């Protein structure tokens, strides 16, 4: 992938290197001290130019000015102020139900295929699980992709994601219209779930706190609904894709880590035993699993980095960088430099063991500072629940011909689906 070229240039030409990314010039900055300086201060904001591709795709508005793609500070802070309420500790705890139900359903489906002969794309299975979780937790709606439903919506998402791949890269005639079809499809599903929400509150019906309630609340006194559909599509996608890929990477890696798996099984037996559903307080004690996930994100971060606009010419690590320059920061790159991580190609979860110094601005799969992931705790919870349940009940072997490796898409994800054969534990 393109991130592997940047790593080579980082290693070779040091901490400040001009590059071309999405066919625009920027400076990739790879010192911890630089990361800290620019990420940990609100003085630095995202670069409209770099995110302008995510805002609109092929003349069809995708994330628009939603929580990811909005770069002006004050406009972003206004939404983030209110959307933040849907991610409080009590908000989160109440989602353990959605996470558990979906996790259980996933494990059950796979148990039905656990003959040890039936190939299953774990990438697909984990995408359906993540979307099912997101759709319900965020919007109070059931997609049931895990049981074959909403196969059109699943297809819209797929095409739209290739869309972003070609929009900001790729330098036939039908494939470009299907992407536009897909983007408008997602916006219309948005309208319906927004409408089906308004109708239920027009019947004065009781509806618990949501991401949906919060996005609506942020869009009050808006002449259009566009700022609301922006945030619908942003969360619909951001709230499932990176989690899906993170899961896929982890199961991929694990299929060739028998010792790690054993310890994982060993751990999950002690904390939950055979209990069907996990309580909020259970996740905290899945400490080794926590470590595996953290290491998974170090080698395989779905969201490989972020951009900040450097407005005034500044001196960065002894290099003069000119004003109006986009800064690229890459957790993928830093995670693979032996300057910051001994023997960096080795998947070693002990790196995050208790007592190890926490990596110091050399590792940020959820980014850092104010533009960090609003969904961090959300995804860390959901990912422990799925992984806990998989480890509890099933074993996965990777089908011969399945490659370990990456593709760059809208996010980093396994090049291959994660085709596996499955057995019951024991
Ligand atoms: C393991 C999965 C996850 C990863 C690795 C992750 C990663 C990221 C990172 C690196 C940023 C990009 C910041 C940038 O562009 O500079 C981000 C943004 C964000 N993520 Fe995620 N994330 C994941 C899951 C989620 C989920 C579950 C949600 C939604 C429920 C979410 C929604 C968002 C939002 C809306 C933002 C923008 C926050 C803001 O600018 O105010 N994340 N996350
Ligand atoms: C369709 O892509 C989903 C949202 C953008 C992916 C992303 N991070 O967001 C994760 C939300 N949970 C992202 C990936 C790469 C870049 C970069 F600018 F580095 F290319 C920026 C954002």
Swiss-Prot record:
Its EC number is 1.14.14.25. It is found in: Endoplasmic reticulum membrane; Microsome membrane; Postsynapse; Presynapse. GO terms for biological process: bile acid biosynthetic process; cholesterol catabolic process; nervous system development; progesterone metabolic process; protein localization to membrane raft; regulation of long-term synaptic potentiation; sterol metabolic process; xenobiotic metabolic process. Signal peptide: none annotated. The keyword Mitochondrion does not apply. Its cofactor is heme. One of its GO terms (molecular function) is heme binding. It catalyses: cholesterol + reduced [NADPH--hemoprotein reductase] + O2 = (24S)-hydroxycholesterol + oxidized [NADPH--hemoprotein reductase] + H2O + H(+); cholestanol + reduced [NADPH--hemoprotein reductase] + O2 = (24S)-hydroxycholestanol + oxidized [NADPH--hemoprotein reductase] + H2O + H(+); 7-dehydrocholesterol + reduced [NADPH--hemoprotein reductase] + O2 = cholesta-5,7-dien-3beta,24S-diol + oxidized [NADPH--hemoprotein reductase] + H2O + H(+); 7-dehydrocholesterol + reduced [NADPH--hemoprotein reductase] + O2 = cholesta-5,7-dien-3beta,25-diol + oxidized [NADPH--hemoprotein reductase] + H2O + H(+). Heme binds at residue 373. PROSITE patterns: CYTOCHROME_P450. Expressed in brain. The mRNA was broadly distributed with higher levels in gray matter zones and lower levels in regions rich in white matter. Not detected in fetal sample but its expression increases linearly with age. Keywords: Cell projection, Cholesterol metabolism, Endoplasmic reticulum, Heme, Iron, Lipid metabolism, Membrane, Metal-binding, Microsome, Monooxygenase, Oxidoreductase, Steroid metabolism, Sterol metabolism, Synapse, Transmembrane, Transmembrane helix. CDD domains: CYP46A1-like. Its main location: endoplasmic reticulum. The keyword Signal does not apply. Belongs to the cytochrome P450 family. P450 monooxygenase that plays a major role in cholesterol homeostasis in the brain. By promoting constant cholesterol elimination in neurons, may activate the mevalonate pathway and coordinate the synthesis of new cholesterol and nonsterol isoprenoids involved in synaptic activity and learning. This is Cholesterol 24-hydroxylase. The gene is CYP46A1.
């Amino acid at each position: 992938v393109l991130q592997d070229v940047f790593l080579d240039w980082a290693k070779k030409y040091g901490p400040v290197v001009r590059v071309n990314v999405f066919h625009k010039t920027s400076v990739i900055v790879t010192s911890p001290e630089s990361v800290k300086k620019f990420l940990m201060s609100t003085k630095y904001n995202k670069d409209s130019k770099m995110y302008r591709a995510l805002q609109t795709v092929f003349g069809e508005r995708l994330f628009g000015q939603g929580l990811v793609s909005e770069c002006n500070y004050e406009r972003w802070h206004k939404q983030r102020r209110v959307i933040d309420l849907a991610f409080s500790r009590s908000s989160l705890v109440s989602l353990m139900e959605t996470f558990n139900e979906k996790a259980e359903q996933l494990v059950e489906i796979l148990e039905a295929k656990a003959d040890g002969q039936t190939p299953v794309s774990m990438q697909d299975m984990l995408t359906y699980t993540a979307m099912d979780i997101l759709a319900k937790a965020a919007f109070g709606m059931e997609t049931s992709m895990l049981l074959g439903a909403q196969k059109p919506l699943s297809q819209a998402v797929k095409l739209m994601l290739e869309g972003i791949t070609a929009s900001r890269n790729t330098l036939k005639r039908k494939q470009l219209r299907e992407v536009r079809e897909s983007i408008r499809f997602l916006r219309q599903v948005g309208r319906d779930w927004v409408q089906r929400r308004r109708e239920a509150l027009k019947r004065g019906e009781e509806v618990p706190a949501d991401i949906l309630t919060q996005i609506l609340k942020a869009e009050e006194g808006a002449q259009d609904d566009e700022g609301l559909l922006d945030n619908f599509v942003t969360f619909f996608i951001a709230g499932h894709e990176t989690s899906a890929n993170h899961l896929a990477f982890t199961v991929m890696e694990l299929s060739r880590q028998p010792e790690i798996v054993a310890r994982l099984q060993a751990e999950v037996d002690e904390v939950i035993g055979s209990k069907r559903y996990l309580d909020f307080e259970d996740l905290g004690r899945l400490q080794y699993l926590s470590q595996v996930l953290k290491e998974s994100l170090r080698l395989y971060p779905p969201a490989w980095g972020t951009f900040r606009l450097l407005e005034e010419e500044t001196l960065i690590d002894g290099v003069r960088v000119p004003g109006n320059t986009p800064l690229l920061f890459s957790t993928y790159v830093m995670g693979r430099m032996d300057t910051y991580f001994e023997d960096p190609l080795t998947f070693n979860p002990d790196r995050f063991g208790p007592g190890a110094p926490k990596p110091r601005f050399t590792y940020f799969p959820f980014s850092l500072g104010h533009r960090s992931c609003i969904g961090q705790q959300f995804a860390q919870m959901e990912v422990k629940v799925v992984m806990a349940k998989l480890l509890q009940r099933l074993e996965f072997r990777l089908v011969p011909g399945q490659r370990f490796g990456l593709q760059e898409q809208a996010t980093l994800k396994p090049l291959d689906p994660v085709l596996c054969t499955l057995r019951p534990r024991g």
